[PDB]
């Protein structure tokens, strides 16, 4: 509760501050609020941290909020490349949307009511389409808003009807109450559609093979600030939802999981294989995000202790790195004014440090040990292998492709021979290099003691 | 534009005995079969009939493809060599120099002063060489990739900066 | 059949222009004009006796080099390494586990003192 009021308190901060201090004042208070948020991984044992009637926290939420509260400074300096020429009021309103976005994500994770979660869950949309469409760069950013929002509501709205139905039947949907007052789900045909309605809403904000057309249609054209926040935390909103909603969807989950986890299983190889054949750099991370995001779909579906820990570990780790590759996308895109992969090549001979950030980014996304990507992915494999022995040949074959496209972007952009006619790349400012540093260091130095990241089942 | 009847046999000979060197290895062995390759090449010098001459090309190439070394020998610096584009890691284009910080260009002041003079030559000779180009282009652009030389004195040959300021083959 | 005059007259124009290009790529004797740096006194008395250059002068230079490298690379590690095991790692049981040395018939134990009886008479196999 002590996080929300200062987060709202940044709303007058940016809107009033002097013409040139708006970003300085916003950057610091976003950095200071990481203090009080950092006291949220501070956690008791199996019992969740319930500090208010309407707000509560646990070891599953705790990594999430500290990610978002940390995240906002990243989009703050990220936007300080192309918002300089805009007017003051537009610049102030950009912070308004980002700060309004924080106020939502910081509150969905703390919500102790299913509807209150859902109200804020889909409330985060309104700040987004403002970011994607108003401050977007390309032409089809207009089609981006329609694809993003309509996909979300088409699944979210049946969830709302499902939630009120549960409200009338059992009486309440408080996350603790449903856990303690659990009831097995009968195999009645009606329960099948209720199960499908409960899950489908989080599936669409969990790019599934087929329900993912808005992934390349939103991330690519979104502004840099909107790109990472939509890929680092927004995709995780469903991840928090499914980890919570599955408490009332058993035993119907196990029999009904086959149509869904398998579609994620086969598509996660397909979507990774998509990255092997791409022409747009920002489309790589978008499709790579789909494959990585679809990996935890299997983990939550098995409802295995190891799978849930691996899901949470990959959830935060993927968000941190996917945001990073979007920053590296921005710097190259800004210098060359194009998103084509094959245009800017041999950049390492010009920007050696930027190549190192590219090296660390693609290598962490490669998920080597001991990085949080690997331990999250490895726990999923072990849980999946216990569920079925054939699972290794599929999800292992993803790691086949996962290493390929991760190095493919590194080789074709940084390595090789520079293209001669590009006379635009200057030396990198201290901004992006610090932005990359603020992305890479928390991931690496979390590796020593990642038990804040595994989750409540740890 | 054209690999006419003259060069085709000239290139064919070049790849022929280079493969033979890859075969014979030893110099004495190579020399014997090289002169036989040469002697058998010009034994039919007087072949005025072009149809037979083109026919004589056919028995030159198809067994060359059969007779080429399965591990063809290539020197390091040429296509397929062990050192082709090996030093591109060090070849940085000349335009990166002006981005150097005042401390970095005060590090080597004489070169930058000379580099500025080099930049001058490009600046007030560009408009002369493009104008010189335009008045000598044939209609519908150029019919050949070859560049015209410097017509009169003073003006540099057209389109000269990058081919002159090209990074050295051994930059380090 | 060879160059057509024009291209040659051009190439030498490019040649002399290339002549001057890397005839400007060298460095004058003063450049690089090394900016001043603060200097430690350690190298000052290293060179105060190095100019002699006779054998034993540089030998003790290398002898300190070996020892000064040793203390900061083989002494300060084992200082904290031995601190780490003997007082933190070995303080936690089952962290450092050892093979018990293989006792052979006839050996004696320092604490018990009892000798393990020698194995009985060999079948007397000789070649």
């Amino acid at each position: 509760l002590k996080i929300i009021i200062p987060t709202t308190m940044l709303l007058p901060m940016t809107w009033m501050s002097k013409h040139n201090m708006i970003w300085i004042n916003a950057t610091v208070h976003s950095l200071l609020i990481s203090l009080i948020s950092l006291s949220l991984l501070n956690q008791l044992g199996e019992n969740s941290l319930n500090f208010s009637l309407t707000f509560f926290s646990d070891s599953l939420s705790a990594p999430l909020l500290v990610l978002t509260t940390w995240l906002l400074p990243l989009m703050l300096m990220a936007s300080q490349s192309h918002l300089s020429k805009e007017t003051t009021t537009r610049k102030k309103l950009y912070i308004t949307m980002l700060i309004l976005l924080q106020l939502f994500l910081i509150m969905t994770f703390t919500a102790t009511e299913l509807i209150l979660f859902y109200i804020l869950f889909e409330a985060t949309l309104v700040p987004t389409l403002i970011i994607i469409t108003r401050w977007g760069n390309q032409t089809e950013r207009l089609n981006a808003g329609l694809y993003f929002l309509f996909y979300t509501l088409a699944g979210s709205l049946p969830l709302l009807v499902a939630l009120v139905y549960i409200q009338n039947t059992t009486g309440s949907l408080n996350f603790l109450i449903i856990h303690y007052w659990s009831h097995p789900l009968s195999n009645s045909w009606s329960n099948i559609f209720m199960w499908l309605a409960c899950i489908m809403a989080f599936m669409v904000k969990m790019p599934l093979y087929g329900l993912h057309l808005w992934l390349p249609k939103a991330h690519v054209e979104a502004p840099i600030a909107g790109s990472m926040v939509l890929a680092a935390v927004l995709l995780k909103l469903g991840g928090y939802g499914m980890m919570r909603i599955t408490t009332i969807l058993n035993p119907l989950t196990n029999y009904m999981a086959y149509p869904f986890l398998m579609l994620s299983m086969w598509g996660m190889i397909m979507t990774s294989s998509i990255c092997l054949r791409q022409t747009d750099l920002k489309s790589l991370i978008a499709y790579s995000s789909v494959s990585h995001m679809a990996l935890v779909i299997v983990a939550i579906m098995i409802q295995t202790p190891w799978s849930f820990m691996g899901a949470t570990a990959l959830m935060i780790a993927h968000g941190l790195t996917s945001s990073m590759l979007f920053c590296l996308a921005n710097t190259n895109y800004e210098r060359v004014h194009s998103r084509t992969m094959i245009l800017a090549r041999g950049l390492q001979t010009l920007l050696p440090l930027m190549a190192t950030w590219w090296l660390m980014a693609s290598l962490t996304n490669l998920a080597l040990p001991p990085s949080i990507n690997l331990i999250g992915e490895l726990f999923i494999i072990t849980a999946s292998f216990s569920w079925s022995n054939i699972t290794i040949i599929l999800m292992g074959m993803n790691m086949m492709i996962t290493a390929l496209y991760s190095l493919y972007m590194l080789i074709t952009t940084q390595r090789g021979k520079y293209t001669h006619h590009i006379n635009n790349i200057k030396a990198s400012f201290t901004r992006e290099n610090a932005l990359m540093a603020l992305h890479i260091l928390p991931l690496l130095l979390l590796t020593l003691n990642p038990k804040m990241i595994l989750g409540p089942l740890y | 534009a054209y690999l006419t009847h003259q060069q085709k046999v000239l290139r064919l000979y070049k790849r022929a005995l280079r493969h033979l060197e890859s075969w014979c290895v030893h110099r004495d062995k190579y020399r014997y079969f090289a002169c036989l390759m040469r002697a058998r090449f010009d034994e039919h010098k007087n072949e005025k009939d072009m149809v037979k001459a083109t026919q004589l090309l056919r028995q030159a190439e198809e067994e060359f493809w059969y007779g080429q070394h399965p591990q063809p020998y290539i020197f390091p610096e040429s296509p397929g060599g062990t050192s082709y584009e090996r030093y591109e890691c060090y070849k940085v284009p000349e335009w990166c120099l002006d981005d150097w910080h005042p401390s970095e260009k005060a590090m080597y002041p004489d070169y930058f002063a000379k580099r500025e003079q080099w930049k001058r030559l490009r600046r007030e000779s560009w408009e002369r060489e493009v104008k010189q180009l335009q008045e000598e282009t044939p209609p519908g652009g150029p019919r050949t990739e070859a560049l015209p030389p410097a017509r009169k004195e003073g003006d540099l040959p057209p389109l000269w900066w990058h081919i002159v300021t090209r990074p050295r083959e051994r930059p380090m | 059949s060879g160059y057509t005059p024009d291209e040659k007259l051009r190439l030498q124009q490019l040649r002399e222009l290339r002549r001057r290009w890397l005839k400007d790529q060298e460095l004058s004797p003063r450049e690089p004009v090394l900016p001043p740096r603060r200097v430690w006194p350690m190298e000052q008395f290293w060179n105060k006796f190095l100019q002699d250059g006779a054998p034993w002068k540089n030998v003790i230079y290398k002898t300190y080099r070996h020892s000064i490298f040793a203390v900061t690379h083989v002494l300060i590690p084992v200082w904290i390494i031995h601190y780490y095991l003997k007082y933190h790692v070995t303080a936690k049981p089952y962290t450092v586990v050892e093979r018990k040395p293989r006792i052979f018939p006839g050996d004696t134990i320092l604490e018990t003192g009892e000798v393990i009886p020698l194995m009985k008479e060999f079948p007397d196999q000789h070649h």
């Binding site: 050696p352 | 000349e94 910080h101 970095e104 | -």
Partner: peptide, 12 residues
């Protein structure tokens, strides 16, 4: 005889 070597600006 040594020649000046071009490098990317490493000061920043």
């Amino acid at each position: 005889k040594r020649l000046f070597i071009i490098k990317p600006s490493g000061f920043y």
